[PDB]
Amino acid sequence: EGKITPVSVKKVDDKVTLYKTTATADSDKFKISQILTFNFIKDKSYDKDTLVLKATGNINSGFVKPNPNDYDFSKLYWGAKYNVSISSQSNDSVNVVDYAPKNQNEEFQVQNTLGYTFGGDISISNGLTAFSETINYKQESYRTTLSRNTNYKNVGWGVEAHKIMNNGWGPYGRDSFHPTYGNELFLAGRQSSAYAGQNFIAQHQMPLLSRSNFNPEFLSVLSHRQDGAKKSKITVTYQREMDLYQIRWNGFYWAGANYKNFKTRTFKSTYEIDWENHKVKLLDTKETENNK
């Protein structure tokens, strides 16, 4: 649910003209916000139309504090993985040809630059030409990977909990397990004389992505062959995988357990891209939930 700005035009040379329009689709319910900036590149010196889509906005973590009154057993929910997916849904003349990030990245701050050269050349470089754009996002303790289903009409990224330190302990992940103490990701003490609900580490000691939100910045380059239909369908999906982290006192020690993707909240928008008129039109929005 949102709006689409009118097209701004920027004549570069006499060969290239840049067209820009921003679409916003939100899920108040899941606290997910999609800001999609479509940069159309018309270059008379190249036999393909180029679309540089910058996806930004917000994806809440879905974090839920533990009940401080839980005595021997307690749990919390945390934002363990953020997935953003872009899919060319129709028109065989359109393909996903490039994107940023283009490779796995576990740096605390992901910064890339995507440049388009008169003639059609797309160059992606580390850090912050007829057109240029940048992606910049913080993901401390997490890792960005390219989704497995990435192909000639699809691109996706996953920003997942990777190396999380408790204090000096760790690093821990969604999968870590001590033969005795289980997953110790957010366990404050193995022998704490405390309520279960009060034996997790403080929220400020957890990664910002696990208990706050993720502000995505991703770029995808769609290419149109200049033959066949002038419009094509595209879907953009922002999603969070929430893990159920729980601790329990067995009379001797505390042990943790992390249920991977125990709750899922997904927001998908579908747009019709008009390559001739450099406009986009919202066709559909869909909120979906998964609860184990």
Curated annotation (Swiss-Prot):
Gene Ontology terms for molecular function: toxin activity
Keywords noted in UniProt: Cytolysis, Hemolysis, Signal, Toxin, Virulence
Keyword Disulfide bond tagged: no
Any Pfam family matching the protein: Leukocidin
Cited SUPFAM superfamilies: Leukocidin-like
Record text on subunit structure and interactions: Toxicity requires sequential binding and synergistic association of a class S and a class F component which form heterooligomeric complexes. HlgB (class F) associates with either hlgA thus forming an AB toxin or with hlgC thus forming a CB toxin. Interacts with host AMFR.
Record's protein name: Gamma-hemolysin component B
This protein's encoding gene: hlgB
